[PDB]
Design a protein around this ligand. Sequence first.
Ligand SMILES: NC(=O)c1ccc[n+]([C@@H]2O[C@H](COP(=O)([O-])OP(=O)(O)OC[C@H]3O[C@@H](n4cnc5c(N)ncnc54)[C@H](OP(=O)(O)O)[C@@H]3O)[C@@H](O)[C@H]2O)c1
Length: 342
Amino acid sequence: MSVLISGASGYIAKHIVRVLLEQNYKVIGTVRSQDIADKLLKQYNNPNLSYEIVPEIANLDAFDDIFKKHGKEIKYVIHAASPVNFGAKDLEKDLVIPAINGTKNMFEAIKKYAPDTVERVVMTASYASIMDPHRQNDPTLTLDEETWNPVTEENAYEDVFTAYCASKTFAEKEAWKFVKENSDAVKFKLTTIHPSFVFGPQNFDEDVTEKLNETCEIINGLLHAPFDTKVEKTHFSQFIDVRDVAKAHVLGFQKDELINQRLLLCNGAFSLQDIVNVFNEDFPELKGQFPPEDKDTDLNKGVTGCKIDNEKTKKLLAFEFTPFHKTIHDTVYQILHKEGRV
Ligand SMILES: NC(=O)c1ccc[n+]([C@@H]2O[C@H](COP(=O)([O-])OP(=O)(O)OC[C@H]3O[C@@H](n4cnc5c(N)ncnc54)[C@H](OP(=O)(O)O)[C@@H]3O)[C@@H](O)[C@H]2O)c1
């Protein structure tokens, strides 16, 4: 009844491991190096938690060693390892290749060593593999759980963001392709989670460092920006709380109605100024120490960009999502409380 989760040191995965441990699961996480494993084991301080070392998912057969040693005992797999680096130097190598190869390596290791053992696979895809990056401010476009990013390998490398979205899209394509062709060879059922911009507090307060993970560094950077910094007010994208994402991942392998499902995790439109407005609204004693408030955003006049039809996802998950104001507030409080300012 064990749960294996790849990339267990990331922002989202650290919340997934907490949720798995709260439900008294035996968890095997994969991390790059021994020192990361040593710090995480000390942080969780839980006998049910162990870590295996996978230093690079892009590389041939990266996950056979785990299923070599642990195959008999692994019942669920959560494939969350994928690079989120909007400062990538080499778009293929740093985003596309690890995303695709990591997913291919994980599924082949299951097929080779635990074909009749693993029951469910929950893969962390992205809203990026459902949305169209060129049409996020298009109110005529409606996105649901069957929509696909139309990006091609030809136009995937427009910039670092389109490359990341293509890496998520191409990786999820390979996963579903693997499932359709190996349906009689392997036993497991596949579920994919598609979060948008994930905000929320870090699972551990001490992980609040100078530079956070990419999406939460959006909030952190704005929180420490000079007062005269330009903040955009036009519609940016969709958000989701990290605690909702972690919860959805665990339900992904417990609930039979989530089998063969793509789960679109969004809970509202926002701009960078709407985030800044939470700084000024919830912590007014620090007004002037970050960009000022301005209620005149796209969101506040009803402009929310492309339509999100995830009623199927919300129905199947059957739990309520965390609203935007609370998500940003909990993120900001953790940083300010860590700095000793509130
Ligand atoms: N953040 C979002 O808004 C968002 C939205 C949708 C989907 N997602 C997906 O959620 C997952 C976690 O995202 P996150 O925000 O938690 O990112 P993160 O904090 O940077 O975590 C990424 C995790 O994956 C590992 N990893 C990445 N590339 C790797 C490679 N080539 N070899 C081995 N390990 C690798 C990282 O290990 P190291 O740090 O040691 O490299 C880290 O543990 C990602 O798959 C991402 O695509 C995120």
